[PDB]
RNA sequence: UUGAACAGAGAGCAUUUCCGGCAGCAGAGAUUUCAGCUGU
């Protein structure tokens, strides 16, 4: 009941700004009760959990942790390990984008000259090879090792596992940046023209295209959280978008000049984007609060990635540079890259490389190894980080040691429970909710007689109109502002009383001046006029 | 899965093994991660027995660590808390899972029923019964556990209408077993060495004979008799006379034999009449089973139970009282057996001699008793 | 510098034989696995579909049926699979309703079997073998009541004797029966109500209110002395059998067809009336009922509880058959067919799974419960699937999109456009209400559960 | 309610207890009648409690042909009486369910707390369990049932024919 | 993917994997399959031309059927594409519409040439032997299979002088002249 | 329908009756465990 972890695993709920009824007093109490019974045997599973997250801690005051090198990682660490850092070396097709699969089997790799590559990459196992001789850009995989989309000189292509084609995408203009949503069976695409474009892949039906009206698209990062994607324009604004709407959810002024890069949290909290600015942002992305902004890089952060463990990998060209715990709200934790005179308030690099000759395509973390896999000019290096990666996976969520038997149930069972392209809302604990209109005291049809009834005497009793009152300052006295925002050539009864009910409050407003300067008393009210009404 | 059940099941003794500070977390994470292991290797598939057993191992090994780390810890025998029985109801549910999964290993039976009665105060003997009665069900030719179940009743709980009821439906079941018999009679002739000695320590202080063992004996031989001319010539009696009466004559010396083997193992009971009770065996086998054990074969057994007969009085010391006051009884005997048979009475003699000669200042007497049996 | 990283080890997650089970290593996080509202809803909404696909109900006619149209129906209430049926034209049989096979038939009377019952007749001399003969009375129109013996394949304990063990006799008609429960005793009503015993042939006693004939009875089934009737004067009237008296009537706007009382709760009833409703009524206090389920279009003819005292089945005298919840007040699945002409005895099986339906047309029917629930028994892993599924389907019922799906069947033509036109005169009842309650003064709000109640003897205070 | 099951078979006396009663008004359904097929969802319904076997192949020739005619052993006798719990003889009887309607008589006549079912769902719950046999057993018996069974029906059909072999 | 049971092949009637809508129906693979078609984009660039025809066809019979401009543009264009090949014969006006095909396009090429030319044995062999640049057109050698032969061009189809395919053609029948090289 | 005596099952329901607190010691079972009495 205590359970040190139970704020990782509470629900958040619905606050107004307790009821008399029995039986449903006793379901709210059963209803409470189940919740935190749930969330407690939901907790104590961190006693169940295999494995621990690694580390490199200094053990010293000389040992910086960012002086250290691959070279000494690969001896201190053990022989599984240091052959899963691999270093692929192709020099003559182009500087090389790499992306792994959502688990950590399969590897894809797409030279910018021509060269595609699908392989298991803990095996030896390439199982597409080829060389589309036209300039390609980007890959992904989409819902397993089975199929990957490149984004080829214009049109974005679809291959199977063994690479043979098995779509050519008519739309999708010119892809540069793919994505896929998992969940919702979504490849999500943007480029060079200003458009972002979903494609169901399981039916084949494009969902939405979504003028972004930006010119090109810069950056393009997946919230993994509520699958909503970021996109980052030549205006240094990044804007939140869903195929739902054809406007972006939400638009943020991140940096001057273009975003270079985005990434964002596994828990859709934080957001790093880099720009052209020589800039890097940490983002709150549930407030959109801006908490950190490391400015003046040596030079433009031209990738940023995120972990599954809050580490935060910058390229700046050669360099490699990670933080760790970057992402947290206390200014102690903005990232630097010296601690001058040993400040222990300082967020010095957790590691950094020097990839020497060349300058880096682009980061990506191998999902639930310790390893960063870094694409680069002339191939494919992963980097031994140490703090990075989740060790305890989940394996009836997507497995690392899955087989074919288990790939095809999977790959069915997905299919199945595939959530539409609308539910993809900015959070996604939106979809049992009410509507925000559509009051919340449920009407019980005696309050829906009391609205027939003042429906029923809006006349005559003046519901629908402002009430008089004198002592508004009636140069703003909203009357006339009833009577200013309604057009000036119709005339309608309601506009009618609310004229009467306007001269009125200017009436009572005139003897209320009248009786503060003095030129009369008391009401005195108009002897003749009391007599003759009756007429 | 239930692997992942079991595994939850498992929490809450370690949320009290870490709250009452003995194992750190690093560690109940270890003993976790063990016990994940045998969990899902017990309930997969290709699950076997020797996984039960390790994981019974394990359990009790980590129990022994707890017990000796609460020693050493806080200076305290037990925790009064959640942490001390939990253990040992785990080790009772893997072996209550593994016997009703795999209910063909006496072994596993055995070492389950080797804990619960091991297990001490905590128990209880319902929780014994229910076992023992599933075991007996699931097998009633085996007939060891009738006879652990029986002793385990008697000699640790002395309830003697239950071990009577136990052996009297176990004989229901296999009245084939002559080991069950035997075992039967021991059981009543150690009650009534129990009931008599019980009854000359409250005479000191201040009717029930072995006839029941006798008629156990006269069914006993009833019984084994008429299954083992049921059992040889298996499935039928399609024969002629002459196996009929060599299957009758097999019978009778497997019969007789073995009643041989009740009188060698019946004569230890010394606090009660040894002699009257091997009397009525010795009369049982005085009579004919239709085979003629003095008038035919059986005529070397005849020679046998003339010469227990002779010795039955003639259990005795080398203080030779009893000897000197009834030699005459055994020369009347040998008398008797010179008088009729022929070579029989050659080795009777000559038996009779060896037994002066094995079981015989004094040795005038000696010379006395050699110049007797001369 | 201490480094250490992720170490998987590789047997941990992939066993060593090749004859079992791979490891499930697993995360409770919720940042593992993120859309946790879509994803129930869509197995929710999945669910409801599979349920529509699932929905097969109707089980098998049983027999041949009946020559002329089966107007009584009853259930034995200690044996789980027997079922015994009074057709129009006199000819009455009980059922084996696992082969669907009559045990035997008999001409039973002459006019109508109006009535028939289940007995354990408690002889002082003679004890029934109740594991070999099963009992079943019946009232009919050429004034007499019947009881029969049936031979049962229930046993095999012995190795005759069937029909008409004895013939009782009246005066007047009778129209239905109902027997106790213990006590060998058991009641008809016709002109009159009369109580009888097995053993005398002639009525222990009279329990009629006035002089107005009685159309249904039924006992109560725990507290099993209470009697209930309706009478053709519209009229609900209790009998108490401890004072030997009739207790308490009320008087309704419609006539009631039948009453069922609740196993479950013992003071309550349901009442199938007229007007196309049904009432649940308490006992302890007549002058309101307490639900009224309200979907049918044409006059309801039957009505029967489940065992467990959950929902009711009803049907009607348009051509179908309805069950409800007992806690909604109206319909949670309508079973209708082409073949099925003018329901009027429904009832609701022992196990509380299926429902016995015998029409005019001269068939009995069964159909099931849940209609998307097989009878297979259930591994582990597909029972923990099925309640998962229905425990999601109930947090999720009211959604739009799985409401009208689970919401939707298909009602045939005659039975749509009555339901559409009612409701349009509902609406335009509704609305000249409101507009008479806007103008005059004294207009009060009678609620719907004493809408139909025109009286009470024995007011309550 | 069909609480035990009685199954005799060429090496013994078994009785089961079961767990679930399959369903009784849908019981020649498809479903219904596919779950005495699979054996995951049989042994959902029997679970063996008890199997006492025979001494040797006399012994089952003589049990075999007393079950042929109908009559109590003492072999059953045993085991029922082992098994069966002492309910009473005027009010609920403990049920067992067998397969044969005039063995039903010979098993009340020495037990009279027992009802003996041999209708159509004691007959499909037997045609379960001698549809998958050994499994059921949880491997607890000594020698292969194709081999007694052999045995055992040439003993009986030599018995019953008188056959001579002088 | 997995041969769907059948609750899931009803609850999931729209999933394909393979074909889509989008493709319709394979075409561009089919008649690149057809007739040995090197790279991907010659169909679309072939279909935009098709398009073009199709729409002008279209625009063109709109026009009121007496009126000369109509008939004339249509007449110039059907000679236009049965001199290119494109089209069989110049008969009707609604081949502009019915008959003019990304495959009538290709049928013009020059390896589909030399296949029904009887120059080579098959469209992939005629696609290797002029990558392997054994046949001119004319005087001059022509080297990638796309080039579309038009009905006159068709006379001049022939491989080149010193090829070791006309060398094993005249020795076969043992015409070989070796004083012209071949 | 009730009661008696008898035979049970472990399958229910409690509780302030003791124990799961230590020494002295015999006894039983493979250096450890179990089986009762004199004061806490």
């Given at each position: 009941?205590?359970?040190?972890?139970?704020?990782?695993?509470?629900?958040?709920?619905?606050?107004?700004?307790?009821?008399?009824?029995?039986?449903?007093?006793?379901?709210?109490?059963?209803?409470?009760?189940?919740?935190?019974?749930?969330?407690?045997?939901?907790?104590?599973?961190?006693?169940?959990?295999?494995?621990?997250?690694?580390?490199?801690?200094?053990?010293?005051?000389?040992?910086?942790?960012?002086?250290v090198q691959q070279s000494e990682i690969k001896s201190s660490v053990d022989v599984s390990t240091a052959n899963k850092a691999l270093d692929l070396?192709?020099?003559?097709?182009?500087?090389?984008?790499?992306?792994?699969?959502?688990?950590?089997?399969?590897?894809?790799?797409?030279?910018?000259?021509?060269?595609?590559?699908?392989?298991?990459?803990?095996?030896?196992?390439?199982?597409?090879?080829?060389?589309?001789?036209?300039?390609?850009?980007?890959?992904?995989?989409?819902?397993?090792?089975?199929?990957?989309?490149?984004?080829?000189?214009?049109?974005?292509?679809?291959?199977?596992?063994?690479?043979?084609?098995?779509?050519?995408?008519?739309?999708?203009?010119?892809?540069?940046?793919?994505?896929?949503?998992?969940?919702?069976?979504?490849?999500?695409?943007?480029?060079?023209?200003?458009?972002?474009?979903?494609?169901?892949?399981?039916?084949?039906?494009?969902?939405?295209?979504?003028?972004?009206?930006?010119?090109?698209?810069?950056?393009?990062?997946?919230?993994?959280?509520?699958?909503?994607?970021?996109?980052?324009?030549?205006?240094?604004?990044?804007?939140?978008?869903?195929?739902?709407?054809?406007?972006?959810?939400?638009?943020?002024?991140?940096?001057?000049?273009?975003?270079?890069?985005?990434?964002?949290?596994?828990?859709?909290?934080?957001?790093?984007?880099?720009?052209?600015?020589?800039?890097?942002?940490?983002?709150?992305?549930?407030?959109?609060?801006?908490?950190?902004?490391?400015?003046?890089?040596?030079?433009?952060?031209?990738?940023?990635?995120?972990?599954?463990?809050?580490?935060?990998?910058?390229?700046?060209?050669?360099?490699?540079?990670?933080?760790?715990?970057?992402?947290?709200?206390?200014?102690?934790?903005?990232?630097?890259?010296?601690?001058?005179?040993?400040?222990?308030?300082?967020?010095?690099?957790?590691?950094?490389?020097?990839?020497?000759?060349?300058?880096?395509?682009?980061?990506?973390?191998?999902?639930?190894?310790?390893?960063?896999?870094?694409?680069?000019?002339?191939?494919?290096?992963?980097?031994?980080?140490?703090?990075?990666?989740?060790?305890?996976?989940?394996?009836?969520?997507?497995?690392?040691?899955?087989?074919?038997?288990?790939?095809?149930?999977?790959?069915?069972?997905?299919?199945?429970?595939?959530?539409?392209?609308?539910?993809?809302?900015?959070?996604?604990?939106?979809?049992?909710?009410?509507?925000?209109?559509?009051?919340?005291?449920?009407?019980?049809?005696?309050?829906?007689?009391?609205?027939?009834?003042?429906?029923?005497?809006?006349?005559?009793?003046?519901?629908?109109?402002?009430?008089?009152?004198?002592?508004?300052?009636?140069?703003?006295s909203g009357l006339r502002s009833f009577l200013r925002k309604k057009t000036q050539n119709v005339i309608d009864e309601r506009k009618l009383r609310?004229?009467?009910?306007?001269?009125?409050?200017?009436?009572?407003?005139?003897?209320?001046?009248?009786?503060?300067?003095?030129?009369?008393?008391?009401?005195?009210?108009?002897?003749?006029?009391?007599?003759?009404?009756?007429? | 899965?239930?692997?992942?059940?079991?595994?939850?099941?498992?929490?809450?003794?370690?949320?009290?093994?870490?709250?009452?500070?003995?194992?750190?977390?690093?560690?109940?994470?270890?003993?976790?991660?063990?016990?994940?292991?045998?969990?899902?290797?017990?309930?997969?598939?290709?699950?076997?027995?020797?996984?039960?057993?390790?994981?019974?191992?394990?359990?009790?090994?980590?129990?022994?660590?707890?017990?000796?780390?609460?020693?050493?810890?806080?200076?305290?025998?037990?925790?009064?808390?959640?942490?001390?029985?939990?253990?040992?109801?785990?080790?009772?549910?893997?072996?209550?899972?593994?016997?009703?999964?795999?209910?063909?290993?006496?072994?596993?039976?055995?070492?389950?029923?080797?804990?619960?009665?091991?297990?001490?105060?905590?128990?209880?003997?319902?929780?014994?019964?229910?076992?023992?009665?599933?075991?007996?069900?699931?097998?009633?030719?085996?007939?060891?556990?009738?006879?652990?179940?029986?002793?385990?009743?008697?000699?640790?709980?002395?309830?003697?209408?239950?071990?009577?009821?136990?052996?009297?439906?176990?004989?229901?079941?296999?009245?084939?077993?002559?080991?069950?018999?035997?075992?039967?009679?021991?059981?009543?002739?150690?009650?009534?060495?129990?009931?008599?000695?019980?009854?000359?320590?409250?005479?000191?202080?201040?009717?029930?004979?072995?006839?029941?063992?006798?008629?156990?004996?006269?069914?006993?031989?009833?019984?084994?008799?008429?299954?083992?001319?049921?059992?040889?010539?298996?499935?039928?009696?399609?024969?002629?006379?002459?196996?009929?009466?060599?299957?009758?004559?097999?019978?009778?010396?497997?019969?007789?034999?073995?009643?041989?083997?009740?009188?060698?193992?019946?004569?230890?009971?010394?606090?009660?009449?040894?002699?009257?009770?091997?009397?009525?065996?010795?009369?049982?086998?005085?009579?004919?089973?239709?085979?003629?054990?003095?008038?035919?074969?059986?005529?070397?057994?005849?020679?046998?139970?003339?010469?227990?007969?002779?010795?039955?009085?003639?259990?005795?010391?080398?203080?030779?009282?009893?000897?000197?006051?009834?030699?005459?009884?055994?020369?009347?005997?040998?008398?008797?057996?010179?008088?009729?048979?022929?070579?029989?009475?050659?080795?009777?003699?000559?038996?009779?001699?060896?037994?002066?000669?094995?079981?015989?200042?004094?040795?005038?007497?000696?010379?006395?008793?050699?110049?007797?049996?001369? | 510098?201490?480094?250490?990283?992720?170490?998987?080890?590789?047997?941990?997650?992939?066993?060593?034989?090749?004859?079992?089970?791979?490891?499930?290593?697993?995360?409770?996080?919720?940042?593992?696995?993120?859309?946790?509202?879509?994803?129930?809803?869509?197995?929710?909404?999945?669910?409801?579909?599979?349920?529509?696909?699932?929905?097969?109900?109707?089980?098998?006619?049983?027999?041949?049926?009946?020559?002329?149209?089966?107007?009584?129906?009853?259930?034995?209430?200690?044996?789980?699979?027997?079922?015994?049926?009074?057709?129009?034209?006199?000819?009455?049989?009980?059922?084996?309703?696992?082969?669907?096979?009559?045990?035997?038939?008999?001409?039973?009377?002459?006019?109508?079997?109006?009535?028939?019952?289940?007995?354990?007749?408690?002889?002082?001399?003679?004890?029934?073998?109740?594991?070999?003969?099963?009992?079943?009375?019946?009232?009919?129109?050429?004034?007499?009541?019947?009881?029969?013996?049936?031979?049962?394949?229930?046993?095999?304990?012995?190795?005759?004797?069937?029909?008409?063990?004895?013939?009782?006799?009246?005066?007047?008609?009778?129209?239905?029966?109902?027997?106790?429960?213990?006590?060998?005793?058991?009641?008809?009503?016709?002109?009159?109500?009369?109580?009888?015993?097995?053993?005398?042939?002639?009525?222990?006693?009279?329990?009629?209110?006035?002089?107005?004939?009685?159309?249904?009875?039924?006992?109560?089934?725990?507290?099993?002395?209470?009697?209930?009737?309706?009478?053709?004067?519209?009229?609900?009237?209790?009998?108490?059998?401890?004072?030997?008296?009739?207790?308490?009537?009320?008087?309704?706007?419609?006539?009631?067809?039948?009453?069922?009382?609740?196993?479950?709760?013992?003071?309550?009833?349901?009442?199938?009336?007229?007007?196309?409703?049904?009432?649940?009524?308490?006992?302890?206090?007549?002058?309101?009922?307490?639900?009224?389920?309200?979907?049918?279009?044409?006059?309801?003819?039957?009505?029967?509880?489940?065992?467990?005292?959950?929902?009711?089945?009803?049907?009607?005298?348009?051509?179908?058959?309805?069950?409800?919840?007992?806690?909604?007040?109206?319909?949670?699945?309508?079973?209708?067919?082409?073949?099925?002409?003018?329901?009027?005895?429904?009832?609701?099986?022992?196990?509380?799974?299926?429902?016995?339906?015998?029409?005019?047309?001269?068939?009995?029917?069964?159909?099931?419960?849940?209609?998307?629930?097989?009878?297979?028994?259930?591994?582990?892993?597909?029972?923990?699937?099925?309640?998962?599924?229905?425990?999601?389907?109930?947090?999720?019922?009211?959604?739009?999109?799985?409401?009208?799906?689970?919401?939707?069947?298909?009602?045939?033509?005659?039975?749509?456009?009555?339901?559409?036109?009612?409701?349009?005169?509902?609406?335009?009842?509704?609305?000249?209400?409101?507009?008479?309650?806007?103008?005059?003064?004294?207009?009060?709000?009678?609620?719907?559960?004493?809408?139909?109640?025109?009286?009470?003897?024995?007011?309550?205070? | 309610?069909?609480?035990?099951?009685?199954?005799?078979?060429?090496?013994?006396?078994?009785?089961?207890?079961?767990?679930?009663?399959?369903?009784?008004?849908?019981?020649?359904?498809?479903?219904?009648?596919?779950?005495?097929?699979?054996?995951?969802?049989?042994?959902?319904?029997?679970?063996?409690?008890?199997?006492?076997?025979?001494?040797?192949?006399?012994?089952?020739?003589?049990?075999?042909?007393?079950?042929?005619?109908?009559?109590?052993?003492?072999?059953?006798?045993?085991?029922?009486?082992?098994?069966?719990?002492?309910?009473?003889?005027?009010?609920?009887?403990?049920?067992?369910?067998?397969?044969?309607?005039?063995?039903?008589?010979?098993?009340?006549?020495?037990?009279?707390?027992?009802?003996?079912?041999?209708?159509?769902?004691?007959?499909?719950?037997?045609?379960?369990?001698?549809?998958?046999?050994?499994?059921?057993?949880?491997?607890?018996?000594?020698?292969?049932?194709?081999?007694?069974?052999?045995?055992?029906?040439?003993?009986?059909?030599?018995?019953?024919?008188?056959?001579?072999?002088? | 993917?997995?041969?769907?049971?059948?609750?899931?092949?009803?609850?999931?009637?729209?999933?394909?994997?393979?074909?889509?809508?989008?493709?319709?129906?394979?075409?561009?693979?089919?008649?690149?399959?057809?007739?040995?078609?090197?790279?991907?984009?010659?169909?679309?660039?072939?279909?935009?031309?098709?398009?073009?025809?199709?729409?002008?066809?279209?625009?063109?019979?709109?026009?009121?059927?007496?009126?000369?401009?109509?008939?004339?543009?249509?007449?110039?264009?059907?000679?236009?594409?049965?001199?290119?090949?494109?089209?069989?014969?110049?008969?009707?006006?609604?081949?502009?519409?019915?008959?003019?095909?990304?495959?009538?396009?290709?049928?013009?090429?020059?390896?589909?040439?030399?296949?029904?030319?009887?120059?080579?044995?098959?469209?992939?062999?005629?696609?290797?032997?002029?990558?392997?640049?054994?046949?001119?057109?004319?005087?001059?050698?022509?080297?990638?299979?796309?080039?579309?032969?038009?009905?006159?061009?068709?006379?001049?189809?022939?491989?080149?002088?010193?090829?070791?395919?006309?060398?094993?053609?005249?020795?076969?029948?043992?015409?070989?002249?070796?004083?012209?090289?071949?």
């Open positions: 009941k205590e359970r040190e972890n139970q704020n990782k695993f509470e629900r958040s709920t619905y606050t107004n700004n307790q009821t008399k009824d029995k039986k449903l007093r006793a379901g709210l109490k059963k209803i409470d009760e189940q919740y935190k019974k749930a969330v407690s045997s939901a907790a104590a599973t961190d006693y169940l959990l295999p494995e621990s997250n690694g580390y490199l801690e200094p053990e010293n005051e000389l040992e910086k942790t960012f002086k070396s192709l020099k003559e097709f182009g500087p090389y984008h790499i992306k792994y699969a959502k688990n950590g089997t399969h590897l894809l790799i797409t030279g910018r000259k021509g060269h595609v590559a699908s392989m298991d990459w803990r095996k030896g196992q390439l199982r597409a090879e080829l060389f589309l001789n036209e300039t390609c850009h980007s890959a992904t995989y989409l819902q397993n090792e089975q199929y990957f989309a490149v984004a080829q000189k214009k049109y974005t292509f679809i291959y199977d596992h063994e690479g043979t084609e098995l779509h050519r995408l008519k739309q999708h203009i010119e892809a540069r940046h793919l994505d896929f949503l998992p969940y919702h069976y979504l490849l999500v695409t943007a480029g060079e023209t200003g458009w972002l474009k979903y494609h169901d892949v399981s039916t084949g039906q494009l969902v939405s295209e979504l003028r972004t009206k930006a010119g090109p698209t810069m950056a393009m990062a997946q919230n993994p959280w509520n699958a909503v994607m970021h996109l980052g324009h030549s205006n240094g604004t990044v804007s939140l978008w869903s195929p739902s709407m054809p406007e972006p959810l939400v638009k943020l002024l991140s940096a001057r000049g273009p975003v270079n890069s985005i990434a964002i949290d596994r828990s859709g909290y934080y957001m790093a984007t880099t720009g052209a600015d020589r800039s890097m942002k940490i983002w709150d992305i549930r407030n959109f609060k801006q908490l950190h902004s490391v400015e003046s890089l040596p030079t433009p952060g031209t990738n940023v990635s995120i972990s599954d463990t809050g580490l935060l990998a910058l390229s700046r060209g050669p360099h490699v540079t990670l933080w760790k715990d970057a992402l947290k709200l206390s200014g102690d934790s903005k990232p630097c890259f010296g601690s001058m005179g040993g400040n222990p308030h300082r967020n010095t690099p957790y590691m950094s490389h020097l990839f020497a000759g060349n300058k880096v395509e682009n980061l990506g973390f191998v999902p639930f190894e310790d390893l960063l896999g870094v694409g680069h000019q002339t191939g494919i290096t992963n980097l031994i980080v140490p703090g990075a990666g989740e060790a305890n996976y989940d394996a009836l969520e997507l497995n690392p040691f899955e087989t074919k038997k288990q790939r095809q149930e999977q790959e069915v069972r997905t299919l199945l429970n595939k959530l539409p392209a609308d539910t993809i809302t900015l959070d996604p604990n939106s979809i049992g909710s009410v509507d925000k209109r559509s009051s919340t005291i449920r009407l019980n049809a005696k309050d829906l007689a009391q609205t027939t009834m003042d429906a029923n005497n809006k006349a005559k009793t003046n519901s629908d109109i402002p009430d008089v009152k004198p002592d508004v300052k009636g140069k703003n609310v004229q009467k009910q306007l001269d009125k409050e200017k009436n009572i407003r005139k003897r209320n001046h009248q009786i503060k300067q003095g030129l009369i008393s008391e009401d005195h009210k108009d002897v003749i006029e009391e007599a003759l009404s009756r007429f | 899965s239930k692997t992942r059940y079991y595994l939850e099941q498992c929490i809450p003794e370690m949320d009290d093994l870490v709250e009452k500070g003995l194992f750190t977390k690093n560690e109940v994470s270890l003993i976790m991660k063990k016990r994940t292991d045998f969990e899902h290797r017990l309930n997969s598939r290709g699950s076997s027995i020797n996984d039960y057993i390790k994981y019974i191992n394990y359990e009790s090994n980590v129990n022994k660590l707890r017990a000796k780390r609460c020693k050493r810890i806080l200076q305290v025998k037990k925790t009064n808390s959640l942490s001390d029985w939990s253990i040992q109801q785990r080790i009772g549910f893997i072996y209550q899972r593994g016997t009703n999964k795999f209910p063909q290993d006496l072994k596993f039976w055995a070492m389950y029923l080797n804990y619960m009665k091991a297990r001490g105060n905590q128990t209880s003997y319902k929780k014994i019964h229910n076992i023992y009665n599933q075991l007996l069900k699931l097998h009633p030719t085996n007939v060891d556990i009738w006879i652990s179940c029986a002793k385990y009743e008697y000699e640790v709980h002395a309830n003697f209408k239950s071990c009577r009821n136990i052996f009297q439906n176990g004989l229901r079941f296999n009245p084939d077993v002559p080991k069950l018999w035997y075992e039967y009679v021991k059981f009543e002739l150690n009650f009534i060495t129990k009931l008599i000695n019980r009854r000359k320590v409250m005479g000191l202080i201040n009717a029930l004979r072995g006839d029941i063992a006798l008629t156990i004996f006269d069914v006993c031989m009833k019984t084994l008799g008429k299954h083992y001319i049921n059992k040889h010539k298996g499935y039928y009696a399609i024969s002629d006379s002459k196996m009929n009466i060599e299957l009758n004559k097999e019978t009778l010396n497997y019969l007789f034999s073995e009643s041989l083997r009740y009188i060698k193992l019946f004569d230890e009971f010394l606090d009660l009449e040894r002699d009257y009770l091997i009397n009525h065996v010795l009369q049982f086998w005085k009579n004919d089973m239709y085979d003629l054990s003095l008038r035919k074969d059986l005529p070397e057994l005849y020679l046998k139970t003339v010469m227990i007969d002779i010795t039955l009085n003639i259990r005795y010391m080398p203080v030779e009282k009893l000897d000197i006051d009834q030699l005459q009884l055994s020369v009347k005997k040998y008398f008797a057996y010179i008088s009729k048979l022929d070579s029989a009475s050659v080795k009777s003699l000559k038996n009779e001699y060896r037994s002066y000669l094995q079981d015989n200042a004094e040795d005038d007497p000696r010379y006395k008793i050699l110049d007797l049996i001369i | 510098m201490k480094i250490k990283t992720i170490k998987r080890s590789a047997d941990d997650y992939v066993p060593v034989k090749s004859t079992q089970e791979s490891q499930m290593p697993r995360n409770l996080n919720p940042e593992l696995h993120p859309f946790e509202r879509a994803r129930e809803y869509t197995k929710a909404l999945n669910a409801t579909k599979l349920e529509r696909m699932f929905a097969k109900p109707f089980v098998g006619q049983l027999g041949y049926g009946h020559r002329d149209g089966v107007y009584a129906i009853a259930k034995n209430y200690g044996s789980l699979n027997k079922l015994a049926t009074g057709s129009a034209d006199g000819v009455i049989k009980y059922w084996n309703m696992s082969t669907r096979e009559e045990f035997v038939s008999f001409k039973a009377h002459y006019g109508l079997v109006t009535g028939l019952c289940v007995t354990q007749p408690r002889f002082h001399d003679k004890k029934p073998d109740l594991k070999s003969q099963n009992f079943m009375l019946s009232c009919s129109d050429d004034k007499t009541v019947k009881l029969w013996s049936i031979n049962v394949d229930d046993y095999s304990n012995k190795n005759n004797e069937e029909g008409l063990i004895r013939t009782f006799d009246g005066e007047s008609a009778f129209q239905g029966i109902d027997s106790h429960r213990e006590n060998s005793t058991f009641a008809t009503g016709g002109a009159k109500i009369h109580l009888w015993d097995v053993n005398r042939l002639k009525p222990v006693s009279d329990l009629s209110w006035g002089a107005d004939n009685i159309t249904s009875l039924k006992f109560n089934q725990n507290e099993t002395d209470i009697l209930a009737s309706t009478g053709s004067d519209n009229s609900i009237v209790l009998y108490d059998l401890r004072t030997n008296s009739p207790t308490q009537k009320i008087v309704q706007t419609m006539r009631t067809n039948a009453i069922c009382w609740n196993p479950m709760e013992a003071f309550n009833f349901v009442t199938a009336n007229e007007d196309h409703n049904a009432y649940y009524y308490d006992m302890r206090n007549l002058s309101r009922s307490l639900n009224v389920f309200k979907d049918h279009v044409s006059a309801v003819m039957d009505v029967d509880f489940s065992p467990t005292g959950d929902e009711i089945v009803t049907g009607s005298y348009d051509k179908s058959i309805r069950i409800y919840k007992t806690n909604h007040g109206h319909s949670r699945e309508i079973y209708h067919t082409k073949r099925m002409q003018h329901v009027f005895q429904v009832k609701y099986s022992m196990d509380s799974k299926y429902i016995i339906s015998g029409s005019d047309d001269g068939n009995v029917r069964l159909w099931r419960s849940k209609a998307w629930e097989r009878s297979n028994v259930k591994t582990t892993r597909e029972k923990n699937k099925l309640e998962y599924d229905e425990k999601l389907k109930e947090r999720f019922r009211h959604m739009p999109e799985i409401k009208r799906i689970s919401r939707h069947r298909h009602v045939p033509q005659v039975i749509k456009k009555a339901q559409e036109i009612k409701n349009i005169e509902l609406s335009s009842i509704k609305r000249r209400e409101a507009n008479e309650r806007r103008t005059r003064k004294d207009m009060p709000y009678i609620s719907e559960r004493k809408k139909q109640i025109v009286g009470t003897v024995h007011k309550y205070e | 309610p069909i609480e035990y099951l009685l199954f005799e078979e060429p090496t013994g006396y078994a009785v089961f207890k079961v767990k679930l009663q399959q369903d009784d008004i849908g019981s020649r359904l498809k479903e219904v009648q596919e779950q005495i097929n699979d054996f995951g969802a049989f042994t959902k319904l029997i679970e063996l409690v008890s199997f006492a076997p025979f001494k040797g192949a006399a012994e089952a020739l003589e049990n075999a042909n007393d079950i042929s005619e109908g009559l109590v052993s003492e072999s059953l006798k045993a085991i029922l009486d082992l098994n069966l719990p002492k309910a009473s003889s005027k009010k609920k009887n403990i049920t067992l369910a067998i397969s044969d309607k005039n063995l039903g008589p010979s098993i009340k006549e020495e037990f009279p707390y027992v009802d003996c079912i041999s209708n159509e769902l004691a007959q499909d719950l037997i045609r379960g369990v001698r549809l998958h046999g050994e499994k059921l057993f949880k491997g607890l018996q000594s020698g292969d049932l194709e081999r007694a069974q052999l045995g055992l029906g040439h003993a009986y059909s030599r018995a019953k024919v008188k056959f001579s072999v002088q | 993917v997995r041969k769907l049971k059948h609750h899931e092949q009803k609850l999931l009637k729209k999933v394909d994997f393979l074909e889509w809508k989008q493709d319709q129906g394979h075409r561009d693979t089919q008649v690149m399959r057809t007739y040995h078609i090197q790279n991907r984009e010659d169909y679309h660039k072939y279909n935009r031309i098709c398009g073009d025809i199709r729409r002008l066809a279209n625009k063109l019979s709109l026009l009121p059927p007496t009126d000369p401009f109509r008939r004339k543009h249509e007449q110039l264009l059907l000679d236009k594409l049965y001199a290119m090949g494109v089209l069989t014969t110049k008969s009707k006006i609604s081949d502009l519409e019915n008959k003019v095909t990304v495959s009538a396009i290709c049928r013009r090429r020059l390896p589909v040439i030399m296949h029904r030319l009887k120059m080579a044995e098959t469209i992939q062999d005629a696609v290797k032997f002029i990558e392997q640049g054994h046949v001119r057109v004319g005087p001059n050698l022509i080297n990638d299979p796309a080039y579309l032969v038009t009905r006159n061009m068709e006379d001049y189809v022939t491989w080149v002088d010193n090829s070791k395919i006309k060398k094993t053609l005249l020795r076969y029948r043992n015409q070989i002249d070796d004083f012209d090289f071949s």
